[PDB]
């Protein structure tokens, strides 16, 4: 299934992922697009912060789902 990723600028990207995919792999796809190390990547879905140890299916993620990416710099 294809998902939409949002950046800090408000850009919508179409990436291909699967329920059997692990958060880690996800961050890898973003890196190849944004070029930012997972150490500075932060995915927040439905308020919850996806962990590099869990997967998409873990959070009952479906197709057409959108996720927000963050840099993580003690902001807020």
Curated annotation (Swiss-Prot):
Glycyl lysine isopeptide (Lys-Gly) (interchain with G-Cter in ubiquitin) cross-link, renumbered residues: 6, 11, 27, 29, 33, 48, 63
Glycyl lysine isopeptide (Gly-Lys) (interchain with K-? in acceptor proteins) cross-link, renumbered residues: 76
Site feature: Essential for function: 68
Modifications after synthesis and translation: Phosphorylated at Ser-65 by PINK1 during mitophagy. Phosphorylated ubiquitin specifically binds and activates parkin (PRKN), triggering mitophagy. Phosphorylation does not affect E1-mediated E2 charging of ubiquitin but affects discharging of E2 enzymes to form polyubiquitin chains. It also affects deubiquitination by deubiquitinase enzymes such as USP30.
Known role: Exists either covalently attached to another protein, or free (unanchored). When covalently bound, it is conjugated to target proteins via an isopeptide bond either as a monomer (monoubiquitin), a polymer linked via different Lys residues of the ubiquitin (polyubiquitin chains) or a linear polymer linked via the initiator Met of the ubiquitin (linear polyubiquitin chains).
Top-rank taxon, per record: Eukaryota
Annotated protein name in UniProt: Ubiquitin
Cellular compartment(s): Cytoplasm; Nucleus
Residues annotated with ADP-ribosylglycine modification: 76
Site note Interacts with activating enzyme, residues: 54, 72
Phosphoserine, modified sites: 65
TM regions (residue ranges): none
Domain Ubiquitin-like residue range list: 1-76
